[PDB]
Amino acid sequence: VEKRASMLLFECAEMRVSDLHIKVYDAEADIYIRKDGDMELLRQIESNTAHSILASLYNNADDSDATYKINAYQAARIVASKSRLALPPVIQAVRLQFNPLGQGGRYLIARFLYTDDPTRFGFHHSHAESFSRMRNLPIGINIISGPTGSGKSTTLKNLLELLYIEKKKKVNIISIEDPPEYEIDGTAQLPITNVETEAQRGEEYRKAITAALRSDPDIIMPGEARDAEVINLLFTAAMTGHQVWTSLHANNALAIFDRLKDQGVDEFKLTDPELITGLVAQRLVRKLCAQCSITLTEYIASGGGISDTDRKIISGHETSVRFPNPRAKKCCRDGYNGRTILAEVIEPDSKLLRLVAEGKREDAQHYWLTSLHGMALKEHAWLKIISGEICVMDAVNKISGIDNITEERKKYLFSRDNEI
Amino acid sequence: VEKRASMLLFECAEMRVSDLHIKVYDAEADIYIRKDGDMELLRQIESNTAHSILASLYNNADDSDATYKINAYQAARIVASKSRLALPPVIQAVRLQFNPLGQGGRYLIARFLYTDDPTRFGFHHSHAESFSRMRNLPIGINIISGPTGSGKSTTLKNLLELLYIEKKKKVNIISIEDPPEYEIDGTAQLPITNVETEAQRGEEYRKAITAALRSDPDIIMPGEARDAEVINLLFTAAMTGHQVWTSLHANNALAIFDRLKDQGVDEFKLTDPELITGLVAQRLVRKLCAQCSITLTEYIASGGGISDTDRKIISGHETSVRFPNPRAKKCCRDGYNGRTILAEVIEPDSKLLRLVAEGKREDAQHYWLTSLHGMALKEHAWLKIISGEICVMDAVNKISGIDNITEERKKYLFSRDNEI
Ligand SMILES: Nc1ncnc2c1ncn2[C@@H]1O[C@H](COP(=O)(O)OP(=O)(O)O)[C@@H](O)[C@H]1O
Ligand SMILES: Nc1ncnc2c1ncn2[C@@H]1O[C@H](COP(=O)(O)OP(=O)(O)O)[C@@H](O)[C@H]1O
Ligand SMILES: [Mg+2]
Ligand SMILES: [Mg+2]
Ligand SMILES: [Zn+2]
Ligand SMILES: [Zn+2]
């Protein structure tokens, strides 16, 4: 049934969910949507209809042949206005993955791609100053780290839009992205055209990187650093006299070096402070509605209670924190509004990189937090909890270790933010 | 349309731009030129005409077959008086790169090659004395480092012209260059003739290097050190009893060793101070017009303002600095005249190389700046800012870290230059 798939994709585009999960059991099938990170239950339908939608989704993709069969792992992709019937204009590509599930069941996951105040998107002012400092530098490599849900592409787009204006259009910027999802002024995104099979995608990505290096690159923005060859090419370009802005998957701002050593980057490449200009780690959390703004007493009287760690976090400022209001008001659909970025930005020095390269993780963290006046993800999350922008539960679900901050550090951060 | 291409190349030769960029969108195409490093907007035309010029440029190259197709990365080269119709005599070769850009768009970059007081080309007198000292030495390897825009080939040409006169024509000099772009007296440039495909160019370069080594080389000037095999051959020739002058791509004068270790040079080759005779890092900046010479007060009254870091740099000498005059006077076309070299020259010792090999970057830099009386790029840029030759904005765009110089170092440099 193509009509059911059309309405399902229309609903997914209208509510702007990220990924769509369909689990088909022997009796009934469940539909889940990943909207703003959290997963919600959309609908529950019969198994035969869901099997029909899954077959229609697989048959309409660009992976024709290797027909739809149960108990098989199958990957596919649907391109808008290119793959048979048309798609909503907000969606460019849908990546489909089919997994077996039990006996007589299926598991489909569709990852949608969307076409889609400039100074701060929830950043701290220290992060903005650090961003300006790294934008002023003409030579170096910058790595943006975080999960797939965080706003890395938007951050890079905004940084390059600011940098193009700041340079008075006297510099050339070249970006390499396999999907040209975000339009950036004066950047000339280079797509990957002859992708062919999935195994040949990396070779064409390397070819695009080398072609961009044979150009006048100056500033380079690859979409993602995935394998060792692309990272080696980027590090070679960084020691040549080019500026590189890249995205990486990592758990921490200081854990970027672990990923680079996993890929194969040598120690003398990571030792230079002039090369590795900046490291950014990002997470996205939900912003509480500023109009409802119920307090801790109202949340306790309504129902529910906080745990011991949440109480320990709250204990510094009781009345300053706010909690979500599930009253279904007209101002907020669910009370969670949009989303904010919690981030940490590090500008390395010689001593910090020497401490990192020697394996002294605790010493390097102490040097960054004390001598360099740094701020981690947990401290920014605690500050946003105290300010009342976000809830404690979402922060402790996204970031761990908020309760481990000492009282002296909390007082120092509060005094530093109140003085400025 | 071949006529439009002919006038475009005539304009590019007449204004002597370095590279030419053409970006073709769905509606209109933009033409950019890289003149004196900065990029300027030449013209805006329609998409069909620009596509016609791009097709005519690709078809007239030496890469016939593999016809001009959209969404494909294509490399080509045009040789003057050899590739079908003739070219201006000032241009030898034009390297063409074609990249996809969006849907129904293209991106062409053409890199022109040109045919093209002897003691200083903007150098400091310490750099001239160091150059004389390295020219007097009969055995060693010298590496010139910098970006592709800096004047490395001209510096090597001038150094070899001075050295041939200083040696009273009692020595043999052999140079290896793939383009024989610069004519040097008594040097006998060896070109690469049977280049065939682009992948076979390195093998013929190695063959030319080995043929030059089978000659009486004495002093050798390869065009560029690109791969590990050529660098290994040059290091083998340096330990044999030959003098090597080479060009390398690097970010810093002391960062040459990082590139050499990346290529595969062992530690005992880099430890010897008698082998690595000198290291030079070069940048090119724009020279302010000496006739207009407006001050800081005139620049402030005309419009615009300097930032906090620029004010911190200026604060030592307010009236000594000068700013560009955009009055469109008859003496200067744009107020930026020609270009000057900001460079750093290091003559290594045993202790400095031992500190570099042990990974002590800060200790090696301190030893070079204090014990060896060295001068970095930032200090030379600051001295040229104070003298009034160049503007602070161009220097801070080209070189970072000018504001990090301490007041004691600034006073020491000013007193040292005023005493001599
Ligand atoms: N303040 C915000 N900052 C970043 N992203 C936001 C923000 N608010 C909403 N979003 C949404 O987060 C989503 C994910 O960001 P994205 O640019 O796609 O990064 P990534 O490529 O790593 O997934 C975006 O679609 C964006 O619309
Ligand atoms: N004082 C100067 N020193 C060096 N180059 C200069 C100077 N003034 C103008 N130029 C120009 O800089 C351009 C680049 O120098 P070049 O010899 O080509 O080095 P490279 O081979 O690394 O590009 C030259 O074409 C030269 O005409
Ligand atoms: Mg992304
Ligand atoms: Mg050269
Ligand atoms: Zn509300
Ligand atoms: Zn003038």
Author numbering:
A (entry chain A), B (entry chain B): 107 to 222, 231 to 534
The authors write:
Purified BfpD was prepared under two nucleotide conditions: either in the presence of ADP (BfpD-ADP data set) or in the presence of ADP, ATP, and the nonhydrolysable ATP analog, AMP-PNP (termed BfpD-ANP data set) at a ratio of 2:4:5. After confirming structural integrity of the sample, cryo-EM and high-throughput data collection yielded 7,207 good movies and 313,223 good particles for BfpD-ADP. Subsequent 3D reconstruction with C6 symmetry yielded resolutions of 3.1 Å, 3.0 Å, and 3.7 Å for BfpD-ADP, BfpD-ANP class-1 and BfpD-ANP class-2, respectively. Additionally, in the BfpD-ADP map, Mg2+ is seen between Ser267 (from the Walker A motif) and the beta-phosphate of ADP. The loop (294-310) carrying the catalytic Glu295 has a well-defined cryo-EM density and is positioned closer to the nucleotide in BfpD-ADP compared to BfpD-ANP, assisted by a hydrogen bond between ADP and Tyr296. Comparison of the BfpD-ADP and BfpD-ANP structures reveals a subtle outward shift in position of the N2D with respect to the CTD such that the mobile innermost N2D loops delineate a circle of 65 Å in diameter (distance between diagonally located Ala172 residues) in the presence of ADP, and 70–73 Å diameter in the presence of ANP class 1 and 2, respectively. This change is accompanied by a slight change in angle of 1.1° for the N2D and 1.6° for the CTD between each monomer and the vertical axis for the BfpD-ANP structure compared to the BfpD-ADP structure, which is consistent with the outward shift in the center of mass described in the much lower resolution TtPilB cryo-EM structure. Transition from BfpD-ADP to BfpD-ANP resulted in a slight outward shift of the top part of the toroid, a tendency more pronounced in BfpD-ANP class 2. Top and side view: As a result of N2D twisting in each of the six subunits, the BfpD ring contracts during the transition from ANP class-2 to ADP and vice versa. The ring closure represents an event of ATP-bound BfpD, progressing to the post-ATP hydrolysis state (ADP).
